[PDB]
Amino acid sequence: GKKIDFLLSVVGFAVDLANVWRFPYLCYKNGGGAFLIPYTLFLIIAGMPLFYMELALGQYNREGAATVWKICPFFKGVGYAVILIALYVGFYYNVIIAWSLYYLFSSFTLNLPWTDCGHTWNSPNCTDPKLLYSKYKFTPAAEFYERGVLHLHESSGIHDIGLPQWQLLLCLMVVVIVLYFSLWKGVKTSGKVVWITATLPYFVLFVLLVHGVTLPGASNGINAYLHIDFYRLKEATVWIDAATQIFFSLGAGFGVLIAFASYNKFDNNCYRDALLTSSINCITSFVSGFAIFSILGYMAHEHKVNIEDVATEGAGLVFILYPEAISTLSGSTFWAVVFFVMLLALGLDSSMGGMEAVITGLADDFQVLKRHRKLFTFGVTFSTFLLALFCITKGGIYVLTLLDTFAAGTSILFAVLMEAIGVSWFYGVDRFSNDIQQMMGFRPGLYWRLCWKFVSPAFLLFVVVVSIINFKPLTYDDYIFPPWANWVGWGIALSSMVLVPIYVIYKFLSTQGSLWERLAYGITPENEHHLVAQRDIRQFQLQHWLAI
Numbered sequence: 438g439k440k441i442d443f444l445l446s447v448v449g450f451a452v453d454l455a456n457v458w459r460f461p462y463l464c465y466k467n468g469g470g471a472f473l474i475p476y477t478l479f480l481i482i483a484g485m486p487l488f489y490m491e492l493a494l495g496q497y498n499r500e501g502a503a504t505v506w507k508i509c510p511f512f513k514g515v516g517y518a519v520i521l522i523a524l525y526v527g528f529y530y531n532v533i534i535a536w537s538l539y540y541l542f543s544s545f546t547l548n549l550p551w552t553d554c555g556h557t558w559n560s561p562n563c564t565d566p567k568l569l570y571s572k573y574k575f576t577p578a579a580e581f582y583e584r585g586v587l588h589l590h591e592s593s594g595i596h597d598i599g600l601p602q603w604q605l606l607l608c609l610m611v612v613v614i615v616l617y618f619s620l621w622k623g624v625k626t627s628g629k630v631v632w633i634t635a636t637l638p639y640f641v642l643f644v645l646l647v648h649g650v651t652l653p654g655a656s657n658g659i660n661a662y663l664h665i666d667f668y669r670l671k672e673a674t675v676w677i678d679a680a681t682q683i684f685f686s687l688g689a690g691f692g693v694l695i696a697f698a699s700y701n702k703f704d705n706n707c708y709r710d711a712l713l714t715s716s717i718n719c720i721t722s723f724v725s726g727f728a729i730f731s732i733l734g735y736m737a738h739e740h741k742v743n744i745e746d747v748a749t750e751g752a753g754l755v756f757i758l759y760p761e762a763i764s765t766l767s768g769s770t771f772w773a774v775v776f777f778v779m780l781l782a783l784g785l786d787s788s789m790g791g792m793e794a795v796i797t798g799l800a801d802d803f804q805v806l807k808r809h810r811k812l813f814t815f816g817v818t819f820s821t822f823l824l825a826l827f828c829i830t831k832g833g834i835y836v837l838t839l840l841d842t843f844a845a846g847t848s849i850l851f852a853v854l855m856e857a858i859g860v861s862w863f864y865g866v867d868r869f870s871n872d873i874q875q876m877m878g879f880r881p882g883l884y885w886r887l888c889w890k891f892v893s894p895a896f897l898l899f900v901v902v903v904s905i906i907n908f909k910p911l912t913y914d915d916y917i918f919p920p921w922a923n924w925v926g927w928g929i930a931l932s933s934m935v936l937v938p939i940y941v942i943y944k945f946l947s948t949q950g951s952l953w954e955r956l957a958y959g960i961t962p963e964n965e966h967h968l969v970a971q972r973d974i975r976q977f978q979l980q981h982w983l984a985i
């Protein structure tokens with residue numbers, strides 16, 4: 438049972454709302470198959486080594502994202518930045534779970550609300566295929582999503598977001614209460630019911646794939662998915678999106694992997710865990726893309742439009758597509774209930790760890806918080822609830838789009854780049870390899886050390902620079918955000934990016950001694966500070982810097 442339970446746990450972690458909700462519309466937005474080449478390249482080159490590095494760091498040091506930097510005191514700013522990014526993500530990651538809960542509540546009927554027009558939310562322009570360069574938006578499913586759930590028709594833009602929708606308000610309250618009561622006792626919440634949260638997503642995906650392959654237009658969708666537009670690979674939008682999606686999907690750069698690995702056994706095999714998680718993530722993402730493109734190829738045929746204009750390119754793509762596919766199944770109410778229960782379970786389980794990252798990271802830094810986990814959990818959860826109330830307004834989709842663009846973009850790329858630089862160069866890739874050997878019994882291969890020191894940092898720096906210099910003003914379908922929205926988004930990104938230099942400055946100023954003494958204290962592990970008075974600093978020799 439040692440292996441079956443391990444396989445089930447890794448498969449449960451490898452599937453989340455990233456693959457099922459975000460990856461579909463990022464793949465649709467970037468043409469289809471042309472998004473997979475950069476995705477796989479980044480996966481290998483940067484994602485797998487960084488996942489391995491974070492797991493090893495957490496396992497060896499037994500600390501969270503903030504306090505793990507006792508080895509290199511100058512990067513506690515990086516730790517704080519990743520904690521802040523994790524805090525930002527929840528604000529809308531929980532709004533997506535609220536959407537799922539609302540859809541589940543709406544699915545308890547013999548006539549699904551998204552099957553035809555004729556409802557109070559339907560507009561005169563609603564067009565039903567059965568009863569008779571834009572994104573269409575006049576289908577029953579799109580009309581339901583945008584008017585009976587979002588009520589987006591009551592907001593003219595991000596300047597007129599309006600008041601929170603009360604139904605989504607109740608759903609968000611329920612989600613927040615469930616999160617709090619699942620996090621208020623401690624980190625130990627696995628191995629009890631996660632079994633059904635690990636197999637249900639794959640059963641749902643398999644049934645969706647099998648049924649959608651045999652649909653009238655699925656062939657065209659599959660052809661578009663497998664076609665590669667090589668001109669799209671010369672624009673850097675696909676590359677930036679692929680890098681951000683890889684780091685979001687795998688979970689690196691948020692302080693979650695380090696926090697959870699801090700509770701591992703000192704001899705746990707992090708290499709095997711990283712390999713299996715990455716492989717399962719890639720396969721699941723590919724299958725999700727296949728199913729999604731089959732569904733929208735079917736829709737292109739049914740609605741008599743081009744496949745590029747069938748659906749939205751935003752965060753509601755799955756909430757449009759999956760209901761459309763469900764409506765084609767036999768006994769569609771049962772399948773809708775099953776699918777939205779699966780979405781609820783996936784989202785709640787993932788958000789649990791997402792918030793645990795923040796809680797553990799800040800409790801390791803302050804013991805007062807560690808002594809009062811209930812109050813601290815309540816505070817974190819309540820703050821998330823309010824800043825998510827900001828995202829369930831009539832124009833809450835605009836705020837959600839801005840957040841999904843800026844909270845973890847260049848910010849997360851920069852944070853992961855700083856993490857890799859810190860470890861590999863300042864702490865020492867040789868020291869890191871020695872720690873991994875002391876833990877798991879073998880030294881990492883040359884490929885892993887090369888990726889940690891040279892390859893991953895180079896690609897991360899390139900992608901950060903390209904994302905900064907090739908920045909497209911924010912949009913949502915046919916809506917263009919005002920420039921101040923772009924300024925606000927870049928400010929949100931900087932709020933996390935800037936913690937690193939600020940903490941470097943603060944650590945330098947708060948230390949006592951001469952300039953060289955301050956540097957030695959700042960780049961020396963906290964448990965070897967007695968060697969600084971001995972003028973024996975490894976980093977002050979070329980051997981440390983040329984070591985691989």
Ligand SMILES: CNCCCN1c2ccccc2CCc2ccccc21
Nearest residue numbers: 453526527686688691693787790791
């Ligand atoms: C790993 N896929 C993302 C799943 C959710 N995610 C969350 C959730 C809420 C807040 C932050 C984050 C950061 C990324 C991450 C990392 C590990 C588990 C979950 C999450």
Ligand SMILES: [Cl-]
Nearest residue numbers: 456460686722
């Ligand atoms: Cl993904």
